[model samples]
Target: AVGACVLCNSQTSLRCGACIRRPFLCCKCCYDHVISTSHKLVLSVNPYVCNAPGCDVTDVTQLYLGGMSYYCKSHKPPISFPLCANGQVFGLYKVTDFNAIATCDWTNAGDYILANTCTERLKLFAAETLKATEETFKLSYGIATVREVLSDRELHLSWEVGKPRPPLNRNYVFTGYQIGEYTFEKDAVVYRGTTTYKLNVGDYFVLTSHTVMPLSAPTLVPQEHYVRITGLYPTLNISDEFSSNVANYQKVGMQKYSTLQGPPGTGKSHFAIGLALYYPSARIVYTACSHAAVDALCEKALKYLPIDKCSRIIPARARVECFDKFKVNSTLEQYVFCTVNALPETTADIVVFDEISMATNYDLSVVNARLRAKHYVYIGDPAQLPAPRTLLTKGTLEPEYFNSVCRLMKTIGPDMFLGTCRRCPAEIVDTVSALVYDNKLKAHKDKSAQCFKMFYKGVITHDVSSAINRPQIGVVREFLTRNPAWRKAVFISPYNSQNAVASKILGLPTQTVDSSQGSEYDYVIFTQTTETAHSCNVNRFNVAITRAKVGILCIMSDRDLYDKLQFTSLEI
Candidate 1:
């Protein structure tokens, strides 16, 4: 790989694997290249390493003896070996892959593996190193009792491996198999990337080696970066909206992939609108984890966008409400909106990712690789909620690791951080700032904050319960019933089930913290209770309370939580 970025002369860079050797580019330069070349980072090689104490060997660097491991006779394990990986010491076991229990019973470890691996991610955000402290637990394999079979490729085996049955999150890679005979030498084959592994009726097989190593992150640069330096920097029709305060806003769509941070009640979405108006010819694609958020931004952008060029792309499999609720006026010529997973394989001058905190590395990377976005603008509050099952929540017990693609990039800092909030009262603003941002974020003291009056609480229980508390839902429903005026006010909760029930009972609309992103109301009524998890979390609760221009009414029943909750400000 080469050094000193060709675009900007920066030394720290990722090599464009698509280019001939000696091709190194910084994140910005890489995206520029991808925009022009339609570059997408390839998974051409699996970088997972062999799990030996002394072997620094990797799947791509070494031979393809096995899809997961390499063992002929020269490179076996230090401990004991059985069939191929299992045939075992290390207490080997096995069974299902979301399948029924076979004698060779390996329960699915997909989610478990993800969950346990999350703990190790805190430090890994650095892109560096891992073993027991860094290395993940050894995935369990099995000694198969060939019960059923195939002519080629698959072996239906009943598990007869004695106790110590564990699960595997990764699918079975073809290891070594025996034909009722345990001859280890002849079973191994040198895989050249394309050959079929044939299986028979009575052959015993091993899933993979019991020793384990973390999967290396892919080395591919996103396809969005391939821009032909000529059209890379475009002038914007800057707006006076946050011209001075939004120091970096104008440059967001100019040349490279970058970040813009907005604290709670800040104009992250408002600035997104200005970004839309800034470019007369550039196409803008707004994306996020939810369609509601995509709709929120589109609804605002529509006022500025030509009636003929405005529309958010709704997914085909989107929920019933998404299709009916999100309306459009344009054919989507200049502005396109789509959720990350639903993003169309299209090109855009730039993509503005809303509620970035809810997005993961996978979502951002996928969009970066999928959309031919010449430039990209990422907007988010890392302190807010993240996408479900995403790595953000999988680390630190964890949001720091899998929380956001931007957070990991080190581009998010004081320069881009919109620290002043103007959407809520100082009381509410300062409250969350202290709770989540450590007072770095300041309140702008808006006049609209006086619209709602609140005192707040009672006590139900303490530390743990299903986030969707039936009891609290009943109380919130009754409270709204009495204060009929509040029915017109926006209500939010952390749990979707609770919000769905509240949305139905309230006869108006109720949004979860995830959906309430980018929305503010004159009066905001948010719920929390003894039975809450992230519902009471600092970031989640901070996001919920800050969505009010007037006052925040936190309706709940919990013990003294002002100090106990991760995100304090339970002060009534």
Candidate 2:
């Protein structure tokens, strides 16, 4: 009859043991009520016998189905099973003893063995199933089946999908799984030194279970934090190495006064981000000379740090928006990233003053008194432009307080210098470093990488003051839109008038050479506003060229302007 099962009134299968109502069940309901718990299955009236080797019992319920053959649960062979239409599950196995195969060929109670042909089971299964194929196999967990097809090795298992129970007491292989690879095992405790660390990326652990674990974890490391600082994320390149060194430095606490100096292309800002995340317990105040510098660091902090713990200091005149659930002044707990002038009255454990070369001793004195910090980390290259006179009150001079903070370094030591240039190509670095940091520094270029060629667009004397060069402007604009990476490019000029015109024309956030100090870009278009070589200075010129990482385009009215300067080596 086309009626439902007698127990639940659902149309399903007519198969069961003699003890219960015969041939009446939904397949799922049958498994739940009888089959799964160890009840025999009755398929037909043909007097079915158990398929186990010596079994002659004619109980119909003692059977199950696999492809075209009937199998008793006791001797159900692990065969390559098919998935719904489009997938094949490959199972992994561990070989114990060759002798165990003969004893447990048909019994789930004993160890199953592998056949000689089964050595290529994974490859053969992938080919035969016409599903996915992989050079190496990753251990699949959850529902699986085991078999002893023939002799030599002890068990072979297939990780089957959409099944109930997982395999028992068996070890599986993960593709390329090595001894030191971190893994989380179910109910297993792992100890590091004295404490048991939680299982996550960067956490040390042992793989002691048959359960398969994930290969990667996003939350394990502050990936986005590092990504925003360094353009290249998800890569184990120079930036990552610099970050690691900074992390190690933080362990030793950089003494009382630590100065980090590096020319452009080195990860100065990225190193600061790593330091901020490492010392969560300490109160940190991040300050930079300009509003633009403060804003850039604030953007990175908002993306990575805990909003409640990390807050930006809004100037008294500027409006501050509520960040996430926390509102400025009302809910914010600490000032993690802030402008040099807008700092709070409270003390800080760590004070990171970015663009320190531009900071005056007076400016730092005001901020430092408020911070009362335990440690001071100043980041900048001394060769870059100093703070403008407008930044200080009338009495202060650039030479008198040019990196006044460097005075502490006399007693402390030479600043921690970042030498590797990850941003620019070797040629650009070599050209720029050759000009600035004496002949001591050199570039290490990767031959395969693409970098914008450093071009010297020969001398063109300015005919009239404040007159625009349409052709030069056109070249700058054309190169800006030439590549997809152009968005990261910056336009820099020594004169405010030139920068204003460029900004109006390109609609880009253009920077003057002095203000652009301590900032880096993928590409930089530099236009010298001076008509004579006397207007150019080596300190300012070095800062302009080093701002670019991948490439630098130097536009000058006088290429002979560099010839006027006294460089140690005339090659530059």
Best by TM-score: 1
Best lDDT among the predictions, by candidate number: 1
The reply for model 2, stretches above 4 Å from the true place, is: 1-243, 246-254, 319-327, 330-335, 390-401, 407-413, 440-489, 500-509, 531-535, 558-572
Tell me the tens digit of each residue's lDDT in model 1 across 1-572: 43454334565324444432223455444444444443333111222234455765432223123334443344654552322131111111110111111011112223323322332222222121112211222334346555554334333445556543332211123343522212110011211111233444465555433332222332123323322432434335455663654346445644466667688767777778776665557788888877678777777766556656666676543332452323443324677777777777778877787787776444555676567666677788777766543122232334443344434433335326778898777767766777767778887784443333322443443212324455555665666666666667776766554554556666657777766766788777776744345655676777777778765556654444343322223222
Worst 10 residues of 1 by lDDT: 95-104
Report the C-alpha displacement of residue 72, candidate 2, in angstroms: 99
The local lDDT score (0 to 100) that residue 181 gets in candidate 2 is 23
TM-score of each: 0.55, 0.47
User: Candidate 2: which pairs clash?
Assistant: 40-61, 41-61, 91-159, 112-154, 113-154, 424-549
Model 2 / residue 8 / CA error / Å: 99
lDDT of 2 by residue, 1-572 (tens): 23344334456434444322233444444444332333443433332355567976544344544554455566656872221112111111101221122112222212111211122221121111111111111222343222322222222334445633221211212211132322111112111111222223322222223322111111011112121222111223334434556443443263555677666757667667656565545666778867667766666666666766766556545422322332354313654666666667776666778877676443555565556666667777666666543212223232222534543332343358777777665655665666666654566654224333322343343423333344555566776676556656688876554655677687767776776776777777776655543236666777776676665666565555444322221111
